[PDB]
Amino acid sequence: AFDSTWKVDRSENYDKFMEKMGVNIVKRKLAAHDNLKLTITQEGNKFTVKESSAFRNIECVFELGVTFNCNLADGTELRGTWSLEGNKLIGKFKRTDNGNELNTVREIIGDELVQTYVYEGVEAKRIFKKD
């Protein structure tokens, strides 16, 4: 789903998240300012997400179930895959840098994409919305 353009319109706890990865207090204070844009497309078994932030736009195309890798605006690099869990889209990502594992979930509240991530027992939330 989420076939169109969107941009983090809401988010919170990003400090506990960015603080769990052990990132300096600099990227943490500048991180909470999550305001990137993301163009997502879906094709049955072929997805295509194109991130875009004034700091480093990214892109990741692939099918659901096949492990792959995707870097996070925080300049992170992880690999895993998204799968449907009950009524949500899970996202198992493993930091290829330190394999600090990452457990997230994706939801589409009507016209908003709620992407929550977990870290060693933490939880960050990032909600998108039609531009």
N, CA, C and O atoms as CSV, one atom per row, in Angstrom:
chain,resi,resn,atom,element,x,y,z
A,1,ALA,N,N,0.860,-1.216,0.000
A,1,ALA,CA,C,0.000,0.000,0.000
A,1,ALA,C,C,0.884,1.249,0.000
A,1,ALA,O,O,2.027,1.195,-0.453
A,2,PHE,N,N,0.377,2.345,0.493
A,2,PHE,CA,C,1.187,3.594,0.519
A,2,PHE,C,C,1.727,3.874,-0.884
A,2,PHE,O,O,2.927,4.095,-1.052
A,3,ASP,N,N,0.872,3.867,-1.865
A,3,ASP,CA,C,1.335,4.136,-3.255
A,3,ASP,C,C,1.275,5.640,-3.530
A,3,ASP,O,O,0.257,6.137,-4.012
A,4,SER,N,N,2.331,6.352,-3.236
A,4,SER,CA,C,2.324,7.823,-3.483
A,4,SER,C,C,3.491,8.478,-2.737
A,4,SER,O,O,4.408,7.784,-2.298
A,5,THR,N,N,3.464,9.776,-2.592
A,5,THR,CA,C,4.570,10.473,-1.878
A,5,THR,C,C,4.123,10.829,-0.460
A,5,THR,O,O,2.948,11.119,-0.237
A,6,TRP,N,N,5.030,10.810,0.476
A,6,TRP,CA,C,4.668,11.138,1.883
A,6,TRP,C,C,5.884,11.730,2.595
A,6,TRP,O,O,6.992,11.684,2.060
A,7,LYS,N,N,5.696,12.274,3.768
A,7,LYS,CA,C,6.849,12.863,4.501
A,7,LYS,C,C,6.581,12.803,6.001
A,7,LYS,O,O,5.526,13.241,6.458
A,8,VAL,N,N,7.506,12.275,6.755
A,8,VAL,CA,C,7.301,12.185,8.225
A,8,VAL,C,C,6.576,13.435,8.718
A,8,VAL,O,O,7.162,14.515,8.780
A,9,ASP,N,N,5.327,13.287,9.059
A,9,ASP,CA,C,4.548,14.447,9.564
A,9,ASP,C,C,4.546,14.395,11.086
A,9,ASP,O,O,4.406,15.427,11.742
A,10,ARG,N,N,4.698,13.222,11.643
A,10,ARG,CA,C,4.711,13.108,13.129
A,10,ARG,C,C,5.766,12.085,13.569
A,10,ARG,O,O,6.185,11.246,12.772
A,11,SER,N,N,6.185,12.153,14.807
A,11,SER,CA,C,7.212,11.195,15.313
A,11,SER,C,C,7.508,11.507,16.784
A,11,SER,O,O,7.273,12.630,17.229
A,12,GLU,N,N,8.007,10.554,17.527
A,12,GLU,CA,C,8.305,10.822,18.964
A,12,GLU,C,C,9.170,9.699,19.545
A,12,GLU,O,O,9.308,8.641,18.932
A,13,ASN,N,N,9.739,9.925,20.701
A,13,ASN,CA,C,10.594,8.883,21.343
A,13,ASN,C,C,11.866,8.675,20.515
A,13,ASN,O,O,12.764,7.947,20.939
A,14,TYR,N,N,11.950,9.291,19.369
A,14,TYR,CA,C,13.163,9.124,18.518
A,14,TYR,C,C,14.423,9.313,19.361
A,14,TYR,O,O,15.490,8.827,18.984
A,15,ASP,N,N,14.322,9.992,20.466
A,15,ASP,CA,C,15.530,10.188,21.312
A,15,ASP,C,C,15.882,8.865,21.983
A,15,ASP,O,O,17.040,8.449,21.959
A,16,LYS,N,N,14.918,8.215,22.568
A,16,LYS,CA,C,15.203,6.910,23.219
A,16,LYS,C,C,15.738,5.957,22.155
A,16,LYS,O,O,16.622,5.147,22.434
A,17,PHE,N,N,15.216,6.049,20.964
A,17,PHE,CA,C,15.693,5.171,19.869
A,17,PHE,C,C,17.117,5.563,19.507
A,17,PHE,O,O,18.047,4.775,19.675
A,18,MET,N,N,17.279,6.754,19.023
A,18,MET,CA,C,18.640,7.225,18.644
A,18,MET,C,C,19.570,7.117,19.853
A,18,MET,O,O,20.787,7.033,19.686
A,19,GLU,N,N,19.027,7.119,21.041
A,19,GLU,CA,C,19.892,7.008,22.245
A,19,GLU,C,C,20.221,5.538,22.490
A,19,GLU,O,O,21.232,5.230,23.121
A,20,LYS,N,N,19.397,4.648,22.010
A,20,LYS,CA,C,19.675,3.202,22.214
A,20,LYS,C,C,20.812,2.781,21.290
A,20,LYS,O,O,21.716,2.061,21.714
A,21,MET,N,N,20.780,3.210,20.058
A,21,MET,CA,C,21.878,2.836,19.125
A,21,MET,C,C,23.202,3.335,19.704
A,21,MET,O,O,24.269,2.922,19.250
A,22,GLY,N,N,23.143,4.202,20.681
A,22,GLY,CA,C,24.398,4.728,21.288
A,22,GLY,C,C,24.955,5.849,20.410
A,22,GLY,O,O,26.168,6.057,20.369
A,23,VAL,N,N,24.098,6.555,19.726
A,23,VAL,CA,C,24.575,7.660,18.850
A,23,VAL,C,C,24.874,8.894,19.703
A,23,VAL,O,O,24.140,9.183,20.648
A,24,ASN,N,N,25.921,9.606,19.386
A,24,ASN,CA,C,26.266,10.820,20.180
A,24,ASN,C,C,24.993,11.620,20.464
A,24,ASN,O,O,23.948,11.342,19.876
A,25,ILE,N,N,25.068,12.588,21.336
A,25,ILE,CA,C,23.858,13.397,21.652
A,25,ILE,C,C,23.636,14.421,20.546
A,25,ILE,O,O,22.665,15.177,20.570
A,26,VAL,N,N,24.518,14.435,19.608
A,26,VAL,CA,C,24.398,15.391,18.473
A,26,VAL,C,C,23.417,14.835,17.445
A,26,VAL,O,O,22.400,15.465,17.156
A,27,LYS,N,N,23.707,13.688,16.905
A,27,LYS,CA,C,22.786,13.086,15.903
A,27,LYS,C,C,21.440,12.813,16.577
A,27,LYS,O,O,20.412,12.745,15.905
A,28,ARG,N,N,21.445,12.661,17.873
A,28,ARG,CA,C,20.173,12.400,18.600
A,28,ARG,C,C,19.344,13.684,18.642
A,28,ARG,O,O,18.148,13.655,18.351
A,29,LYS,N,N,19.953,14.784,18.992
A,29,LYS,CA,C,19.198,16.067,19.049
A,29,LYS,C,C,18.814,16.502,17.634
A,29,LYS,O,O,17.760,17.107,17.440
A,30,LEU,N,N,19.641,16.209,16.668
A,30,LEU,CA,C,19.325,16.612,15.268
A,30,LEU,C,C,18.462,15.550,14.605
A,30,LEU,O,O,17.888,15.779,13.540
A,31,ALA,N,N,18.377,14.425,15.220
A,31,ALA,CA,C,17.563,13.311,14.653
A,31,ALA,C,C,16.076,13.575,14.905
A,31,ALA,O,O,15.277,13.540,13.969
A,32,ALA,N,N,15.707,13.831,16.130
A,32,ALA,CA,C,14.270,14.090,16.438
A,32,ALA,C,C,13.658,14.968,15.344
A,32,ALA,O,O,12.456,14.889,15.090
A,33,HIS,N,N,14.453,15.784,14.709
A,33,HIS,CA,C,13.916,16.663,13.632
A,33,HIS,C,C,13.647,15.828,12.378
A,33,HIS,O,O,14.021,16.233,11.277
A,34,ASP,N,N,13.019,14.695,12.531
A,34,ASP,CA,C,12.732,13.837,11.346
A,34,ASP,C,C,11.735,14.545,10.427
A,34,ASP,O,O,10.589,14.771,10.814
A,35,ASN,N,N,12.155,14.888,9.240
A,35,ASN,CA,C,11.244,15.579,8.286
A,35,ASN,C,C,11.609,15.165,6.857
A,35,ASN,O,O,11.656,16.011,5.965
A,36,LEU,N,N,11.861,13.903,6.638
A,36,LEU,CA,C,12.253,13.447,5.275
A,36,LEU,C,C,11.024,13.079,4.436
A,36,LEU,O,O,9.926,12.911,4.967
A,37,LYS,N,N,11.220,12.961,3.147
A,37,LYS,CA,C,10.109,12.591,2.226
A,37,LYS,C,C,10.349,11.163,1.722
A,37,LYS,O,O,11.500,10.744,1.603
A,38,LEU,N,N,9.310,10.428,1.432
A,38,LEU,CA,C,9.509,9.034,0.944
A,38,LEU,C,C,8.457,8.685,-0.113
A,38,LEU,O,O,7.260,8.842,0.129
A,39,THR,N,N,8.888,8.222,-1.256
A,39,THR,CA,C,7.923,7.832,-2.323
A,39,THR,C,C,7.827,6.307,-2.342
A,39,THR,O,O,8.789,5.637,-2.718
A,40,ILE,N,N,6.705,5.760,-1.953
A,40,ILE,CA,C,6.584,4.272,-1.919
A,40,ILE,C,C,5.652,3.761,-3.016
A,40,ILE,O,O,4.638,4.389,-3.321
A,41,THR,N,N,5.996,2.639,-3.593
A,41,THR,CA,C,5.151,2.034,-4.650
A,41,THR,C,C,5.039,0.538,-4.361
A,41,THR,O,O,5.945,-0.036,-3.756
A,42,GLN,N,N,3.975,-0.089,-4.771
A,42,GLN,CA,C,3.829,-1.547,-4.493
A,42,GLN,C,C,3.330,-2.272,-5.745
A,42,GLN,O,O,2.506,-1.733,-6.484
A,43,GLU,N,N,3.812,-3.462,-5.982
A,43,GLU,CA,C,3.358,-4.224,-7.176
A,43,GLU,C,C,3.239,-5.706,-6.808
A,43,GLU,O,O,4.124,-6.498,-7.133
A,44,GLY,N,N,2.176,-6.073,-6.147
A,44,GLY,CA,C,1.988,-7.499,-5.759
A,44,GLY,C,C,3.225,-8.013,-5.018
A,44,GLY,O,O,3.288,-7.934,-3.791
A,45,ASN,N,N,4.186,-8.527,-5.738
A,45,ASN,CA,C,5.417,-9.067,-5.086
A,45,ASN,C,C,6.627,-8.212,-5.464
A,45,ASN,O,O,7.747,-8.720,-5.513
A,46,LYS,N,N,6.421,-6.954,-5.725
A,46,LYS,CA,C,7.549,-6.076,-6.083
A,46,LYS,C,C,7.283,-4.708,-5.478
A,46,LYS,O,O,6.380,-3.992,-5.909
A,47,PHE,N,N,8.053,-4.363,-4.505
A,47,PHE,CA,C,7.878,-3.049,-3.831
A,47,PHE,C,C,8.977,-2.100,-4.295
A,47,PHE,O,O,9.990,-2.547,-4.834
A,48,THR,N,N,8.796,-0.827,-4.099
A,48,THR,CA,C,9.836,0.134,-4.516
A,48,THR,C,C,9.713,1.378,-3.642
A,48,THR,O,O,8.822,2.201,-3.854
A,49,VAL,N,N,10.580,1.514,-2.687
A,49,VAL,CA,C,10.523,2.696,-1.786
A,49,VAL,C,C,11.672,3.648,-2.116
A,49,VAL,O,O,12.825,3.223,-2.195
A,50,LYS,N,N,11.372,4.905,-2.304
A,50,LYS,CA,C,12.441,5.888,-2.631
A,50,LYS,C,C,12.495,6.960,-1.540
A,50,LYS,O,O,11.682,7.884,-1.544
A,51,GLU,N,N,13.424,6.848,-0.629
A,51,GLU,CA,C,13.528,7.865,0.451
A,51,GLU,C,C,14.122,9.146,-0.134
A,51,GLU,O,O,14.748,9.103,-1.193
A,52,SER,N,N,13.942,10.257,0.523
A,52,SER,CA,C,14.505,11.522,0.000
A,52,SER,C,C,14.589,12.538,1.127
A,52,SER,O,O,13.575,13.078,1.570
A,53,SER,N,N,15.776,12.787,1.575
A,53,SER,CA,C,15.991,13.775,2.657
A,53,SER,C,C,17.083,14.742,2.205
A,53,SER,O,O,18.024,14.331,1.527
A,54,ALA,N,N,16.975,15.989,2.562
A,54,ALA,CA,C,18.016,16.966,2.144
A,54,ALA,C,C,19.378,16.516,2.674
A,54,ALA,O,O,20.355,17.257,2.568
A,55,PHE,N,N,19.451,15.333,3.233
A,55,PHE,CA,C,20.746,14.853,3.789
A,55,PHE,C,C,21.263,13.629,3.021
A,55,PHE,O,O,22.457,13.338,3.091
A,56,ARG,N,N,20.421,12.920,2.307
A,56,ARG,CA,C,20.921,11.726,1.570
A,56,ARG,C,C,19.737,10.875,1.121
A,56,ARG,O,O,19.337,9.949,1.827
A,57,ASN,N,N,19.188,11.173,-0.019
A,57,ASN,CA,C,18.028,10.382,-0.518
A,57,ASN,C,C,18.461,8.931,-0.735
A,57,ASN,O,O,19.622,8.674,-1.052
A,58,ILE,N,N,17.555,8.001,-0.570
A,58,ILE,CA,C,17.914,6.567,-0.748
A,58,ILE,C,C,16.823,5.846,-1.532
A,58,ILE,O,O,15.777,6.424,-1.827
A,59,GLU,N,N,17.065,4.610,-1.860
A,59,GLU,CA,C,16.058,3.823,-2.625
A,59,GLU,C,C,16.245,2.329,-2.340
A,59,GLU,O,O,17.371,1.875,-2.137
A,60,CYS,N,N,15.175,1.584,-2.324
A,60,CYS,CA,C,15.284,0.123,-2.054
A,60,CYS,C,C,14.144,-0.617,-2.760
A,60,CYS,O,O,12.985,-0.479,-2.367
A,61,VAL,N,N,14.453,-1.381,-3.773
A,61,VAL,CA,C,13.392,-2.130,-4.498
A,61,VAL,C,C,13.518,-3.617,-4.173
A,61,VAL,O,O,14.633,-4.129,-4.071
A,62,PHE,N,N,12.422,-4.302,-4.011
A,62,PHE,CA,C,12.525,-5.760,-3.703
A,62,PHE,C,C,11.140,-6.358,-3.439
A,62,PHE,O,O,10.150,-5.631,-3.359
A,63,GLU,N,N,11.079,-7.657,-3.306
A,63,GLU,CA,C,9.782,-8.331,-3.025
A,63,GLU,C,C,9.694,-8.604,-1.523
A,63,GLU,O,O,10.710,-8.533,-0.831
A,64,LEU,N,N,8.533,-8.908,-1.015
A,64,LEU,CA,C,8.424,-9.175,0.446
A,64,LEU,C,C,8.843,-10.619,0.738
A,64,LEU,O,O,8.370,-11.544,0.078
A,65,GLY,N,N,9.708,-10.812,1.700
A,65,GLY,CA,C,10.155,-12.195,2.038
A,65,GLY,C,C,11.639,-12.369,1.693
A,65,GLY,O,O,12.342,-13.121,2.367
A,66,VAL,N,N,12.110,-11.699,0.675
A,66,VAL,CA,C,13.545,-11.841,0.292
A,66,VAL,C,C,14.393,-10.826,1.065
A,66,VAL,O,O,14.212,-9.619,0.902
A,67,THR,N,N,15.297,-11.297,1.885
A,67,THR,CA,C,16.158,-10.367,2.668
A,67,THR,C,C,16.885,-9.417,1.730
A,67,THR,O,O,17.263,-9.791,0.620
A,68,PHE,N,N,17.072,-8.216,2.173
A,68,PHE,CA,C,17.795,-7.209,1.358
A,68,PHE,C,C,18.421,-6.203,2.310
A,68,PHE,O,O,18.400,-6.415,3.523
A,69,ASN,N,N,18.966,-5.137,1.804
A,69,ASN,CA,C,19.587,-4.139,2.708
A,69,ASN,C,C,19.081,-2.739,2.367
A,69,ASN,O,O,18.742,-2.461,1.217
A,70,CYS,N,N,19.031,-1.879,3.344
A,70,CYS,CA,C,18.561,-0.492,3.101
A,70,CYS,C,C,19.178,0.410,4.164
A,70,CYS,O,O,19.161,0.064,5.346
A,71,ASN,N,N,19.711,1.531,3.777
A,71,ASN,CA,C,20.345,2.424,4.781
A,71,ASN,C,C,19.309,3.390,5.358
A,71,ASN,O,O,18.362,3.767,4.669
A,72,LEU,N,N,19.482,3.782,6.592
A,72,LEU,CA,C,18.513,4.725,7.216
A,72,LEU,C,C,19.087,6.143,7.172
A,72,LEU,O,O,20.300,6.324,7.269
A,73,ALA,N,N,18.238,7.126,7.031
A,73,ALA,CA,C,18.719,8.536,6.976
A,73,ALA,C,C,19.794,8.759,8.039
A,73,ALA,O,O,20.716,9.547,7.826
A,74,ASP,N,N,19.691,8.092,9.154
A,74,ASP,CA,C,20.714,8.274,10.222
A,74,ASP,C,C,22.065,7.754,9.729
A,74,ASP,O,O,22.994,7.597,10.521
A,75,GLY,N,N,22.178,7.491,8.454
A,75,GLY,CA,C,23.469,6.980,7.911
A,75,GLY,C,C,23.701,5.553,8.406
A,75,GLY,O,O,24.848,5.123,8.531
A,76,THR,N,N,22.648,4.831,8.683
A,76,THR,CA,C,22.805,3.439,9.170
A,76,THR,C,C,22.598,2.468,8.010
A,76,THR,O,O,22.035,2.839,6.980
A,77,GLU,N,N,23.040,1.256,8.170
A,77,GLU,CA,C,22.876,0.241,7.094
A,77,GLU,C,C,22.329,-1.047,7.709
A,77,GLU,O,O,22.984,-1.642,8.566
A,78,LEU,N,N,21.163,-1.481,7.297
A,78,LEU,CA,C,20.595,-2.731,7.893
A,78,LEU,C,C,20.026,-3.640,6.802
A,78,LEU,O,O,19.787,-3.191,5.681
A,79,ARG,N,N,19.815,-4.891,7.123
A,79,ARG,CA,C,19.254,-5.842,6.117
A,79,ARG,C,C,18.279,-6.805,6.798
A,79,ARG,O,O,18.512,-7.219,7.933
A,80,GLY,N,N,17.211,-7.157,6.126
A,80,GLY,CA,C,16.227,-8.082,6.723
A,80,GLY,C,C,15.045,-8.176,5.771
A,80,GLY,O,O,15.207,-8.628,4.637
A,81,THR,N,N,13.886,-7.769,6.195
A,81,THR,CA,C,12.712,-7.833,5.275
A,81,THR,C,C,11.423,-7.490,6.014
A,81,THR,O,O,11.351,-7.611,7.237
A,82,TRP,N,N,10.426,-7.071,5.283
A,82,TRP,CA,C,9.118,-6.746,5.919
A,82,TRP,C,C,8.148,-7.899,5.665
A,82,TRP,O,O,8.153,-8.478,4.578
A,83,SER,N,N,7.336,-8.233,6.629
A,83,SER,CA,C,6.373,-9.351,6.430
A,83,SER,C,C,5.060,-8.992,7.117
A,83,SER,O,O,5.067,-8.178,8.041
A,84,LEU,N,N,3.966,-9.553,6.710
A,84,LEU,CA,C,2.698,-9.191,7.376
A,84,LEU,C,C,2.522,-10.014,8.645
A,84,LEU,O,O,2.498,-11.244,8.601
A,85,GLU,N,N,2.401,-9.341,9.749
A,85,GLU,CA,C,2.209,-10.034,11.044
A,85,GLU,C,C,0.791,-9.737,11.528
A,85,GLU,O,O,0.507,-8.615,11.947
A,86,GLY,N,N,-0.079,-10.703,11.477
A,86,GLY,CA,C,-1.477,-10.448,11.911
A,86,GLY,C,C,-2.081,-9.382,10.997
A,86,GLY,O,O,-2.466,-9.686,9.868
A,87,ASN,N,N,-2.166,-8.165,11.462
A,87,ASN,CA,C,-2.736,-7.080,10.610
A,87,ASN,C,C,-1.736,-5.925,10.501
A,87,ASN,O,O,-2.146,-4.767,10.418
A,88,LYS,N,N,-0.461,-6.213,10.499
A,88,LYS,CA,C,0.545,-5.117,10.399
A,88,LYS,C,C,1.708,-5.563,9.511
A,88,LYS,O,O,1.865,-6.756,9.253
A,89,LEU,N,N,2.505,-4.635,9.052
A,89,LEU,CA,C,3.665,-5.005,8.195
A,89,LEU,C,C,4.936,-4.943,9.042
A,89,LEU,O,O,5.427,-3.852,9.334
A,90,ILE,N,N,5.462,-6.071,9.431
A,90,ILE,CA,C,6.691,-6.058,10.272
A,90,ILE,C,C,7.903,-5.678,9.429
A,90,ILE,O,O,7.850,-5.710,8.199
A,91,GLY,N,N,8.971,-5.325,10.084
A,91,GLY,CA,C,10.219,-4.933,9.377
A,91,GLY,C,C,11.410,-5.376,10.223
A,91,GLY,O,O,11.830,-4.653,11.127
A,92,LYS,N,N,11.943,-6.525,9.944
A,92,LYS,CA,C,13.099,-7.018,10.737
A,92,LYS,C,C,14.385,-6.511,10.099
A,92,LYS,O,O,14.797,-7.020,9.057
A,93,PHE,N,N,15.012,-5.534,10.696
A,93,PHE,CA,C,16.269,-4.983,10.114
A,93,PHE,C,C,17.435,-5.229,11.059
A,93,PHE,O,O,17.313,-5.045,12.270
A,94,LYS,N,N,18.541,-5.638,10.510
A,94,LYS,CA,C,19.742,-5.899,11.343
A,94,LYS,C,C,20.855,-4.937,10.937
A,94,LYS,O,O,21.331,-4.988,9.803
A,95,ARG,N,N,21.264,-4.082,11.831
A,95,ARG,CA,C,22.349,-3.121,11.497
A,95,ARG,C,C,23.545,-3.897,10.952
A,95,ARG,O,O,24.155,-4.680,11.680
A,96,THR,N,N,23.880,-3.694,9.712
A,96,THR,CA,C,25.032,-4.430,9.126
A,96,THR,C,C,26.320,-3.914,9.734
A,96,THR,O,O,27.383,-4.517,9.585
A,97,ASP,N,N,26.211,-2.828,10.396
A,97,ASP,CA,C,27.396,-2.206,11.048
A,97,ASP,C,C,27.725,-2.960,12.337
A,97,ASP,O,O,28.872,-3.355,12.544
A,98,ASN,N,N,26.753,-3.157,13.183
A,98,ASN,CA,C,27.007,-3.881,14.459
A,98,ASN,C,C,25.934,-4.951,14.682
A,98,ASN,O,O,25.844,-5.508,15.776
A,99,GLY,N,N,25.140,-5.239,13.686
A,99,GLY,CA,C,24.081,-6.275,13.858
A,99,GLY,C,C,23.338,-6.038,15.175
A,99,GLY,O,O,23.041,-6.992,15.894
A,100,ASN,N,N,23.043,-4.806,15.489
A,100,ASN,CA,C,22.319,-4.513,16.759
A,100,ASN,C,C,20.836,-4.829,16.582
A,100,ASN,O,O,19.995,-4.343,17.340
A,101,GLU,N,N,20.531,-5.624,15.604
A,101,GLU,CA,C,19.116,-6.017,15.326
A,101,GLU,C,C,18.171,-4.814,15.442
A,101,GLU,O,O,18.499,-3.824,16.097
A,102,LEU,N,N,17.028,-4.904,14.819
A,102,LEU,CA,C,16.037,-3.796,14.878
A,102,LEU,C,C,14.659,-4.380,14.573
A,102,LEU,O,O,14.491,-5.048,13.553
A,103,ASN,N,N,13.690,-4.148,15.419
A,103,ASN,CA,C,12.335,-4.712,15.154
A,103,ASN,C,C,11.345,-3.566,14.963
A,103,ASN,O,O,11.078,-2.821,15.906
A,104,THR,N,N,10.810,-3.417,13.782
A,104,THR,CA,C,9.862,-2.298,13.539
A,104,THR,C,C,8.535,-2.810,12.981
A,104,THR,O,O,8.380,-4.003,12.719
A,105,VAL,N,N,7.600,-1.916,12.808
A,105,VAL,CA,C,6.270,-2.295,12.259
A,105,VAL,C,C,5.757,-1.149,11.383
A,105,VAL,O,O,6.035,0.014,11.672
A,106,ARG,N,N,5.029,-1.454,10.342
A,106,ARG,CA,C,4.515,-0.371,9.453
A,106,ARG,C,C,2.988,-0.431,9.388
A,106,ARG,O,O,2.419,-1.504,9.190
A,107,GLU,N,N,2.336,0.691,9.550
A,107,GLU,CA,C,0.849,0.715,9.492
A,107,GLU,C,C,0.423,1.894,8.612
A,107,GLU,O,O,1.195,2.837,8.441
A,108,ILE,N,N,-0.763,1.859,8.064
A,108,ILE,CA,C,-1.218,2.973,7.209
A,108,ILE,C,C,-2.547,3.482,7.740
A,108,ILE,O,O,-3.605,3.101,7.240
A,109,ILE,N,N,-2.499,4.320,8.728
A,109,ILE,CA,C,-3.761,4.851,9.305
A,109,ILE,C,C,-4.501,5.654,8.240
A,109,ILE,O,O,-4.264,6.852,8.088
A,110,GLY,N,N,-5.374,5.013,7.522
A,110,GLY,CA,C,-6.151,5.728,6.470
A,110,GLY,C,C,-5.202,6.421,5.487
A,110,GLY,O,O,-4.973,5.909,4.391
A,111,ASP,N,N,-4.658,7.553,5.858
A,111,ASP,CA,C,-3.742,8.278,4.930
A,111,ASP,C,C,-2.450,8.663,5.658
A,111,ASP,O,O,-1.823,9.665,5.313
A,112,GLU,N,N,-2.058,7.896,6.635
A,112,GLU,CA,C,-0.806,8.208,7.375
A,112,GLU,C,C,-0.013,6.917,7.570
A,112,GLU,O,O,-0.598,5.886,7.906
A,113,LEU,N,N,1.279,6.951,7.372
A,113,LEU,CA,C,2.080,5.701,7.546
A,113,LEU,C,C,2.725,5.686,8.923
A,113,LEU,O,O,3.629,6.480,9.186
A,114,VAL,N,N,2.287,4.818,9.786
A,114,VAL,CA,C,2.904,4.760,11.136
A,114,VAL,C,C,4.032,3.734,11.112
A,114,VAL,O,O,3.776,2.540,10.953
A,115,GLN,N,N,5.248,4.173,11.264
A,115,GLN,CA,C,6.391,3.221,11.244
A,115,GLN,C,C,7.059,3.232,12.612
A,115,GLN,O,O,7.791,4.168,12.933
A,116,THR,N,N,6.822,2.227,13.405
A,116,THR,CA,C,7.442,2.192,14.753
A,116,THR,C,C,8.625,1.234,14.745
A,116,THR,O,O,8.585,0.204,14.073
A,117,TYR,N,N,9.652,1.558,15.471
A,117,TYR,CA,C,10.834,0.655,15.527
A,117,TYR,C,C,11.145,0.317,16.971
A,117,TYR,O,O,10.870,1.105,17.877
A,118,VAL,N,N,11.703,-0.826,17.175
A,118,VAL,CA,C,12.085,-1.256,18.547
A,118,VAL,C,C,13.581,-1.446,18.580
A,118,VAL,O,O,14.183,-1.836,17.580
A,119,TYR,N,N,14.172,-1.182,19.692
A,119,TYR,CA,C,15.640,-1.344,19.785
A,119,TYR,C,C,16.047,-1.836,21.174
A,119,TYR,O,O,15.940,-1.105,22.159
A,120,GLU,N,N,16.503,-3.052,21.237
A,120,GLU,CA,C,16.960,-3.643,22.529
A,120,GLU,C,C,15.933,-3.418,23.632
A,120,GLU,O,O,16.264,-3.518,24.813
A,121,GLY,N,N,14.725,-3.122,23.270
A,121,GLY,CA,C,13.677,-2.902,24.304
A,121,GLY,C,C,13.269,-1.437,24.293
A,121,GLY,O,O,12.849,-0.900,25.318
A,122,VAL,N,N,13.388,-0.802,23.164
A,122,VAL,CA,C,12.994,0.614,23.063
A,122,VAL,C,C,11.967,0.714,21.966
A,122,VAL,O,O,11.661,-0.286,21.318
A,123,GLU,N,N,11.441,1.865,21.745
A,123,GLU,CA,C,10.428,1.976,20.676
A,123,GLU,C,C,10.347,3.404,20.130
A,123,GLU,O,O,10.001,4.330,20.864
A,124,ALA,N,N,10.660,3.579,18.873
A,124,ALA,CA,C,10.572,4.934,18.255
A,124,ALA,C,C,9.355,4.959,17.330
A,124,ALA,O,O,8.985,3.920,16.784
A,125,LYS,N,N,8.739,6.097,17.145
A,125,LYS,CA,C,7.543,6.144,16.260
A,125,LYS,C,C,7.710,7.226,15.191
A,125,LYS,O,O,8.176,8.326,15.490
A,126,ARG,N,N,7.339,6.924,13.975
A,126,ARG,CA,C,7.449,7.931,12.882
A,126,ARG,C,C,6.208,7.809,12.000
A,126,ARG,O,O,6.022,6.786,11.342
A,127,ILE,N,N,5.373,8.815,11.975
A,127,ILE,CA,C,4.133,8.721,11.153
A,127,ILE,C,C,4.209,9.643,9.939
A,127,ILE,O,O,4.542,10.821,10.068
A,128,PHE,N,N,3.906,9.114,8.785
A,128,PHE,CA,C,3.932,9.947,7.549
A,128,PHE,C,C,2.506,10.376,7.194
A,128,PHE,O,O,1.551,9.971,7.857
A,129,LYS,N,N,2.368,11.179,6.172
A,129,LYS,CA,C,1.019,11.643,5.742
A,129,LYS,C,C,1.125,12.231,4.333
A,129,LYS,O,O,2.180,12.745,3.959
A,130,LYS,N,N,0.070,12.165,3.566
A,130,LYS,CA,C,0.121,12.713,2.180
A,130,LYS,C,C,0.744,14.111,2.204
A,130,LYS,O,O,0.368,14.942,3.031
A,131,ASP,N,N,1.673,14.367,1.324
A,131,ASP,CA,C,2.320,15.710,1.293
A,131,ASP,C,C,1.246,16.792,1.172
A,131,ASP,O,O,1.569,17.980,1.129
